[PDB]
């Protein structure tokens, strides 16, 4: 209501404070422009008006959006521009281009760069071959490959709408057009990329023959088609940008596209809609398992390929894998999973905070976060004992003795992930958050006492309930407050189940349905005959306290105890089950009072419930599969060769483009650069201020034909065209520069003399070829920071979500938080302690410590710049990373042209960037493996310029052309609108899971972010289900990053697979790996006999080596492009995999023939001349042949 307004006012105040200094510095004339080059917006209309224009459209956009919506407003704006009420523009194509750009900016919220980069040109073409009638064609460049399916589809749709409104005929191709398009699709798939999608030829034919526009563009790849010289096309190469929009755009997003069309009320696409429509007795648990297998079938698409070094953590839907839990933690929910740190530790630290893994059920991909309120693995030690490693320290302690991982642990997956991907709900395993609801309901129904979990209750109700149940009121309050951490003792749980009539507490339930009733029958017989047990009493309830049975008598039933997840120990040839876990096993079996007998068409829990008086629920029925990929990252950003100043040097600096070295040797460099001329005296050089008089200079325009030089004032009168010729001038020309004088002047200017290296660029890629001042480069070199293409310093890190935090996790005092603005905790009580949970504001971020270490250097560089180059007071004044708290940054995604402002409040000790889910959505990012940048606001304000951007096509991608100062959840994204914000899932959800419903049938029972849109409470109150002790607890670096060799990687991965019981290494892992080494072996062997030799001095490539033996027209030797060692680098690991594991004979023979083929090719060039002292190095090929 008012706290949000105060927050946004403070943000604007700080932004103004930085902008004033940036404006003051830039007005001295030491930079390409006399003002800052990053305007600030406030909403979608401002971003659209800035990025594409035309001027004044912001008001119309706002009013139309408030009246109708978004799509209707976009189309009405299209019509308004077409009628031409914003000023005369010119030809028809100009009107069409402007309308399509503005509309596609309006529909995508004006963040992605598709309107500016993807669309290269719109033109009108005539159907010359058949009718000669007009039609519209859209030229698509390379950067359209990044926009997204929705962006491509909406571009196609808006082009179709504009061409319909322009009175143009439908596009009408020939048959050769269709054939060429099919061949292009096939060539792109088999030579460039898999496209993550592959429509059938008939589907593509339908689309191409039904698409009313020409989807074309310039060439992008070096491949030529066979259907050459097709009319109407000015190229015979692969036009990737033209086919991507067809494949992954309209075709791959048919449902969303048709929904959009229906919303817009435009017809003519009924064929696409039709295409989408065409695309469209026994025991209780026995039946439930059957139905579950029938409806939700296992999926395998995630494990179709395993790379070397990236382990597989579970087989598809195999018991013993990841136990599904429904919930959302403090720092998970957007697309991430919650994992216990003990499971991270006990898999050899292959999993670390922020590591991506390719999942199976809900989506494809997620990021792992530590949750300490769920369960960890159950392991079997080397002496035969079973343990429950639910703790981080215990996992660290017992890691060496582990022999098998009986169970892997839980995974917390949000309900909003199932709604997004449209996945049928899998049955829910029994847990504490379900038991507590059943407990409360039964208490109310039997005694008429009202209580609520996860909150605070009235004292009178607590006293009544405690008196009825005869327990401590304080214990009742504690258990109702945190049911996930406080559990009753086993005898008390049995007493509750006796009195109220509810299943046994899920903590003392074993995995009964993981064994067959016959095994339990055998075990019952053994326990009844040869076991010694000690009994107890509690309120008239008898329970076991200890079981001792000899190992020889127990026999092969010890595996049943291990598969039930029962902790025991072995001592002196006996197996002992101790206090909490003797009743866990003997109470369900009736304390050996009724015999256990197997039945057909029944499960273990069914028999237990049919015969016993205390009921049980299936503790584990749903499992998930996952696999490792893409370790985390919190590293900086550098160019391919690192750069520190945007100054051209050529080859005068060497391979490393060292400007200082070139300056020292008195060399002279010739490069294309822009010169400026002082109006008063006549100094000429690559500078913006004249050293003699210190007055701003003017750019020199040069005629390419006669080399006449014209100042900026003169060229304006001539319209930038030479008088003596009729050709356009240029702002630059090839010129000679002496690095020594310039570097000495810069050194004298900033008083920085000790810099040893100063890297530059070979040549400038912009169309102005303006250089950057050398003083900035010297200061950057001194402070050890690097520059980016647009003149900014950036830091890249993986992103994770967070909505609530503890002051102790991020190392910030309560007084500092109160100064920043935080006053309460997420329950309304005042903030007085560092153990309380405080809700995060939408635009506050939590950096890592690597980010802090780098941004300290960046802050020092900015302070030095302000003090030395500009002569202004310093700004940050920081000595440690915690002096940056309260300072602003800019977040930017690599595929967008707009940024958003954020504030620093603390640091963690992981390799991820934590932030609100709204913050990541505002950048159009999904939070399941994506990486984004951050930069200090003042650095970008001072340094960023629009004259340094490459001119190729996508020089404007990944650049802050505009920044957003406020956050609006209504226009950030659409995947974050499905997140759930309830404190706990209701009982109805749990009961409906057993019916295998779909999430859409119960979308109104669980509150999501969508339900609150529009109302003031979309920044105010959001909640979570699962708590966490620490948000950065667990391993911080993946073990994959410290393995050197490929053989070592494969060995460690295979050992991990051996340990886990639900992976089945022995042949599946090795076969799927061999189908990653065999392709390399065979491809390199084939490519060796048809290679292309190259010259080591030049880069010219010859089909076959010169007869002389040395490069003619050069003074260098001839080298290979496919060395001999490139073929056989993975042969040792392949032979190890074939000889150590159980693979099919086909693969073994393939490897054994590959070795012979490698040996036989080089028989006449590398004869086997060296004899050996000993033979038989455990070869498998020779043994196979001999057998």
């Amino acid at each position: 209501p008012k706290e949000m307004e105060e927050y946004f006012e403070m943000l604007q105040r700080e932004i103004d404070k930085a902008y004033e200094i940036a404006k003051k510095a830039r007005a001295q004339g030491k930079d390409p422009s006399l003002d800052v080059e990053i305007p600030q917006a406030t909403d979608m209309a401002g971003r659209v008006e800035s990025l594409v224009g035309p001027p004044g459209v912001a008001k119309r956009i706002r009013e139309l959006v408030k009246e109708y919506g978004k799509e209707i407003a976009a189309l009405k704006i299209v019509d308004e521009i077409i009628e031409g009420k914003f000023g005369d523009l010119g030809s028809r194509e100009k009107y069409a281009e402007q309308a399509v750009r503005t509309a596609l900016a309006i529909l995508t919220e004006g963040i992605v760069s598709a309107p500016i980069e993807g669309i290269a040109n719109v033109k009108i073409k005539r159907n010359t071959w058949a009718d000669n009638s007009e039609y519209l064609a859209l030229y698509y460049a390379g950067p359209i490959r990044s926009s997204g399916g929705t962006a491509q589809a909406l571009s196609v749709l808006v082009g179709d709408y504009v061409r319909r409104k322009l009175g143009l005929d439908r596009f009408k191709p020939s048959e050769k057009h269709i054939e060429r398009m099919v061949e292009e699709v096939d060539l792109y798939h088999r030579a460039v990329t898999r496209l993550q999608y592959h429509p059938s030829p008939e589907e593509v034919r339908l689309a191409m023959r039904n698409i009313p526009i020409e989807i074309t563009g310039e060439a992008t790849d070096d491949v030529e088609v066979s259907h050459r010289d097709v009319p109407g096309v000015e190229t015979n190469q692969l036009r990737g940008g033209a086919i991507l929009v067809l494949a992954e755009g309209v075709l791959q997003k048919a449902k969303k596209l048709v929904k959009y069309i229906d919303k817009m009320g435009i017809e003519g696409w009924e064929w696409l809609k039709e295409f989408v429509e065409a695309k469209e007795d026994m025991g209780f648990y026995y039946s439930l398992y059957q139905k579950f297998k029938e409806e939700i079938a296992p999926s395998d698409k995630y494990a179709k390929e395993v790379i070397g070094g990236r382990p597989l953590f579970s087989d598809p839907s195999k018991p013993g894998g990841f136990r599904l839990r429904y919930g959302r933690s403090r720092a998970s929910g957007f697309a991430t999973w919650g994992i216990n740190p003990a499971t991270m530790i006990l898999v050899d630290e292959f999993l670390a905070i922020g590591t991506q893994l390719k999942t199976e059920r809900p989506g494809k991909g997620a990021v792992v976060t530590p949750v300490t309120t769920i369960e960890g693995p159950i392991v079997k030690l080397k002496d035969g004992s079973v343990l429950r490693v639910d703790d981080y320290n215990l996992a660290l302690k017992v890691r060496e003795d582990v022999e098998e991982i009986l169970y892997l642990g839980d995974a917390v997956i949000a309900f909003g992930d199932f709604v997004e991907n449209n996945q049928t709900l899998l049955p829910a395993n029994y847990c504490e958050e379900w038991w507590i609801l059943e407990f409360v309901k039964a208490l109310k129904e039997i005694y008429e006492v009202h209580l609520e979990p996860f909150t605070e209750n009235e004292e009178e109700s607590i006293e009544e309930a405690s008196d009825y149940l005869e327990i401590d009121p304080e214990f009742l309050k504690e258990m109702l407050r945190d049911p996930l951490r406080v559990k009753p003792p086993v005898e008390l749980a049995i007493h509750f189940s006796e009195v109220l009539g509810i299943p046994l507490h899920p903590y003392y339930t074993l995995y009964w349905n993981s064994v067959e009733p016959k095994d339990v029958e055998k075990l019952w017989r053994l326990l009844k005959n040869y076991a010694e047990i000690e009994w107890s009493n509690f309120r008239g309830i008898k329970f076991a306290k200890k079981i001792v049975i000899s190992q020889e008598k127990l026999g092969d039933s010890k595996r049943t105890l291990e598969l039930l997840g029962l902790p025991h120990t072995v001592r002196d040839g006996n197996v002992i089950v101790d206090y909490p876990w003797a009743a866990a096993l003997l109470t369900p079996l009736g304390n050996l009072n009724w015999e256990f007998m197997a039945k057909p068409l029944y499960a273990t829990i069914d028999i237990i419930n049919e015969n016993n008086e205390i009921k049980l629920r299936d503790r584990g029925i749903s499992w998930i599969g996952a696999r490792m990929g893409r370790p985390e990252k919190a590293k900086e950003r550098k160019m391919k060769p690192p750069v520190q100043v945007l100054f051209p040097i050529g080859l005068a600096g060497g391979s490393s483009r060292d400007i200082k070295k070139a300056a020292e040797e008195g060399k002279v460099a010739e490069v294309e650069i822009a010169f400026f001329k002082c109006p008063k005296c006549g100094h000429v050089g690559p500078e913006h201020l004249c050293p003699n008089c210190g007055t701003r200079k003017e750019l020199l325009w040069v005629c390419p034909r006669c080399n006449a030089e014209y100042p900026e004032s003169q060229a304006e009168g001539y319209n930038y065209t030479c008088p003596k010729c009729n050709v356009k001038l240029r702002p630059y020309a090839k010129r000679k520069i002496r690095p020594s004088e310039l570097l000495n002047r810069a050194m004298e200017n900033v008083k920085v003399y000790g810099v040893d290296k100063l890297k530059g660029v070979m040549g400038m890629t912009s169309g102005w070829k303006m250089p950057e001042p050398l003083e900035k480069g010297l200061l950057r070199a001194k402070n050890d920071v690097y520059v980016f293409k647009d003149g900014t310093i950036r830091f890249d890190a993986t992103d994770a979500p967070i909505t609530h935090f503890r002051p102790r996790e991020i190392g910030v005092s309560v007084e500092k938080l109160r100064e920043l603005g935080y006053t309460h905790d997420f329950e309304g009580k005042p903030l007085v302690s560092e153990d309380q949970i405080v809700e995060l504001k939408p635009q506050d971020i939590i950096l890592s410590k690597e980010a802090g270490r780098y941004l300290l250097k960046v802050a020092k560089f900015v302070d030095d710049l302000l003090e030395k180059f500009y002569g202004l007071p310093r700004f940050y004044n920081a000595e440690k990373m915690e002096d940056l708290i309260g300072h602003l940054v800019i977040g930017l995604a690599p595929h967008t042209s707009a940024g958003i402002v954020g504030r620093i409040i603390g640091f963690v000790d992981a390799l991820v960037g934590y932030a609100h889910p709204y913050f990541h959505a505002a950048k159009r990012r999904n939070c399941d493996g994506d990486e984004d940048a951050v930069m200090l606001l003042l650095d970008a304000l001072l340094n960023f310029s629009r004259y340094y951007l490459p001119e190729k096509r996508g020089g404007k991608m990944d650049a802050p052309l505009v920044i957003t100062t406020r956050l609006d959840p209504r226009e950030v994204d659409s995947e974050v609108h499905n997140m759930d914000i309830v404190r706990y899932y209701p009982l109805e959800f749990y009961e409906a899971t057993y019916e295998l419903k779909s999430p859409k049938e119960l979308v109104g029972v669980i509150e999501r972010v969508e339900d609150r849109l529009g109302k003031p409470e979309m920044y105010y109150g959001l909640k979570f289900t699962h708590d966490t002790d620490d948000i950065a607890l667990g391993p911080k670096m993946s073990l994959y990053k410290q393995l050197g060799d490929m053989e070592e990687k494969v060995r460690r991965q295979l050992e991990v697979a051996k340990r886990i019981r639900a992976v089945d290494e022995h042949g599946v892992a090795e076969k799927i790996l061999n189908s990653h080494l065999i392709p390399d072996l065979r491809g390199n062997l084939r490519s060796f006999t048809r290679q292309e030799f190259r010259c080591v001095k030049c880069n010219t490539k010859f089909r076959r080596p010169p007869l002389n033996g040395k490069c003619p027209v050069c003074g260098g030797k001839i080298v290979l492009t496919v060395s001999k060692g490139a073929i056989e680098k993975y042969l040792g690991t392949a032979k190890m995999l074939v000889t150590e594991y159980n693979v099919k004979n086909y693969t073994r023979q393939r490897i054994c023939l590959t070795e012979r083929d490698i040996d036989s090719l080089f028989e006449n060039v590398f004869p086997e001349t060296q004899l050996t002292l000993i033979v038989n190095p455990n070869d498998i090929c020779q043994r196979l042949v001999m057998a």
Binding site: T1172, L1173, I1174, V1175
Partner: protein, 118 residues
Amino acid sequence: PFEIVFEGAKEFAQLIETASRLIDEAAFKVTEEGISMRAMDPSRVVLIDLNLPASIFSKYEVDGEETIGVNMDHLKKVLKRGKAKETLILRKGEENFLEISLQGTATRTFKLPLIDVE
């Protein structure tokens, strides 16, 4: 628990460095007579055998017999840290750690963890 004293650590370093060029890991057999070693390189083309009876050693003290294995690179570096006129001392206790000390102008002791080799 043994106490072996060798004069001229430089010669010992040279001998071990020469031995280590072809191979990577080896097991030293120590008995009441001396120290013996033998191994074959990974390419199965060279076999190196070395022995050092107690006569050469200035002081020898061994009870029984044991085999001690250690990486050749780390041992080579530690020996290279020795000087021309120092006296090398190889000593070990019950704990399975190899303690190397060089006693010249000053006494410096390094610890080198053990390794088991087939």
